[PDB]
Every structure is written in C-alpha cells, then in structure tokens.
C-alpha cells in the first residue's frame, strides 16, 4: 500500500503554525522520487538523509507535520534556528534527521481583502522543546498581576494574525510547509521505500 502523502500535500486546507498538523505514517511503501522528482516546491532541504538514498531505507514511523507561515520565516524551519516561529510555534531538534518542504501558496492562502485565518503564537514565556505543540489561548500575562481572561495593560492575547495579502512581497506571502520526520526505534520498521 502506498503511504498517503497525497492527502497531506493535496490538502485543500492547511493549519496555522501555532497548531501545526501532524500525520503519522506507518505500514506502507513510499516513493520519495515522486516528491522530489517534481520541482513544484521552492524549499526542499533534507537534514541527515539524502532524498535519492531514501527509497532503499526503512523507518518504524514517518511523521508529516504541515502548517502555513510567512514566506520569509521558512528559514526558521531548520535545526538550531531562532525567531517567533522556531521559538514559539514549531521547533526542529538540533540532531534532526528529516526533510523540510515548502511551496508558495499566494493563490489559496492570500484572499482578496486579506486572510486572517492564519495566526501564529506571538507571545510565550519560554521556548518550545522540539516537536512540542502549544494550543493555549489563555490571556498572556506580561505583568506580575493576573489577567483573568481580558486584554489590557500587561495582558496580551497570544495568537495574532498574518495579514495574508496577495499583492505583498514574496517574503510576506503564505508558504505551505511539510516537515518529514524519519524515526527508527527498536520496533518493526514498516515504512519502506521500494
């Protein structure tokens, strides 16, 4: 059976980076030629693995995390990077063995008028641990006095919106991103290439 990468790249609706989606792939055959045979992507670095030398390997599990970010934040989805997205939204471990894929989606993620469905966590007390996911919508407390569910001085709503406008520069245009994580523990490795 083929690994369902098509219901991850062909997804009509992607998720906000703060609540990045995660697919866990298992027990199937995956052709990583078709992914990187097509040059439809703008960014495709593979860390700790070669894409052409990936069809001969096997992994107990492969993880397909997907989200939408600003075009100039895609450089933050690499090992040991810092910023709003890497710090407070999606973190790649320093010892990362995987691939990062990204394509411009100024056609679907930037609507006439501006798209505000895509938020990112802009306020956090400390950094995510790698592959951590934080969905808290509590009023962020920057002061030494509680906020209790209402915005104001020292009280910031933590999620903010990208104002995705199609007329903006490419650095500010939505890029869809897929981060393939290849893991292997002492258990049956069921995700094999051909």
């Amino acid at each position: 059976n083929l690994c369902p990468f098509g219901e991850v790249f062909n997804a009509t609706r992607f998720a906000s980076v703060y609540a990045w989606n995660r697919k866990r792939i298992s027990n199937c055959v995956a052709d990583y030629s078709v992914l990187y045979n097509s040059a439809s992507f703008s960014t495709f670095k593979c860390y700790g693995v070669s894409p052409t030398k990936l069809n001969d390997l096997c992994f107990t599990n492969v993880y397909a995390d997907s989200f939408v970010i600003r075009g100039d934040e895609v450089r933050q989805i690499a090992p040991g990077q810092t910023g709003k997205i890497a710090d407070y939204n999606y973190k790649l471990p320093d010892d990362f063995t995987g691939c990062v894929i990204a394509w411009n989606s100024n056609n679907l993620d930037s609507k006439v008028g501006g798209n505000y469905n895509y938020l990112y966590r802009l306020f956090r007390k400390s950094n995510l641990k790698p592959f951590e996911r934080d969905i808290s919508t509590e009023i962020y407390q920057a002061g030494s006095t509680p906020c209790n569910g209402v915005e104001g001085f020292n009280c910031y709503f933590p999620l903010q919106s990208y104002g995705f406008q199609p007329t903006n520069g490419v650095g500010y245009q939505p890029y869809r991103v897929v981060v393939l994580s290849f893991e292997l523990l002492h258990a049956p490795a069921t995700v094999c290439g051909p």
Partner: antibody
Amino acid sequence: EVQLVESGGGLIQPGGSLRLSCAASGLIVSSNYMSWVRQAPGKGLEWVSVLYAGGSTDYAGSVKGRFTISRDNSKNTLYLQMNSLRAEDTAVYYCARDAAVYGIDVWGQGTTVTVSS
Amino acid sequence: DIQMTQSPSSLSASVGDRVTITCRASQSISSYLNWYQQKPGKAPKLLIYAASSLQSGVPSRFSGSGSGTDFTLTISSLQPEDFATYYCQQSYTTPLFTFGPGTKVDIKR
C-alpha cells in the same frame, strides 16, 4: 510603578565599551520582548537589538557582533553591552518593552552615548 | 523589509485647527501600525496602537485611521501641548519594527 529607568551612558572613545542598564518596574522584562532603540541627533528612531521571553536575541547589522543584549531576572534589569564602539553609535539610547500589536507603550527616559576620540 | 513614509515632513497649524498626518507602507500592513509623539529631549509616547485603538492616558482628540498601506493620525483640536513630532511604527514584522521619518507640527504664523 510602570517605569523603565536607564543609566550607564556617557563619553567613551572608539574601540571602547559600555554597559547600559534598563531597570524595570510595573512589568517583567523576562516575559516581554525588550528592544533597544537609539536616536541620533535630529535623526529619528532606529531599532538596535531585542531579546524575547525565551532568551533569543537579535540585533541590527551595524552592531551585530559588537553589541550584546541580556538581563538579570532577579533585579528585573535589562542590559546592553556595547563593545568595539564606533562614531556612528553616538546617539540617545532608549529601552522599551514591545507589546507587538499593542505597540511600544513603555519607553525609558533615555541615556546619551557619545563615542568620540 | 518594509519602508515607512510620512505625508508632510513639516506642517504649520493653528491652535484649534484639525490636523491630519499621513503614513504609508511598502506593503499591506493591514492595521498593524502604531503612532507616537515626541517633544525635543523627551522620549516617544504611544497614542494609537493597531491603526485606530486609542491608548489609555492620551486625550480623546487623537483619532487613528487607515487599514492597508495608507494610514492617518488626526488631531481634532490642536492644543498648545500638541506641537511635537509624530512618527508611525510598524507591528507587521515584530519584534523588528521600522519607523517613519516623522512629521514636525509647528505654530502657524
């Protein structure tokens, strides 16, 4: 007591160093983005370097490599270490808390930094 | 990056006049813009955050408007403590914000 009280600026020759100090009160620097802004005489506001709540820091190309933002959570003070100064760094330095979409609402009183041989 | 520009570099206005400063942006910032005021030898003061939200502690005559690339602070009735410089700042690429050059408002004569 919402206030940012800075100090530590003065007169220093080039290649020199200085440590600016933004003592905070009314907020917690540790859980806030804290920028350093400078304004050269009759020039205008220019960002210098920030420091997030996660300890990540970031600076502008002109000081990247010469400046260093930090903080001592216990004293609730924010600091800027200015090493290898140049004559293009002569400006008034302001410490602010950036509230992102809420704006830079709390500004410091400003400390002057003159770098001349 | 994002460039920010202000309509009139200088401006002459009378006490009781309705002043209108303008600010423009390289891209569609979509109301992520703040307005400040600065009198010589003092620090900036926030006036309007997020395009039109008035900042508590600021007089009711300060209006904030604009939504995409063209923006506008408006003082309804200029008063004697209103002669200062007003800059706009950008919240789109926070925490790396850029500012406008400023608009100096002075005493018409």
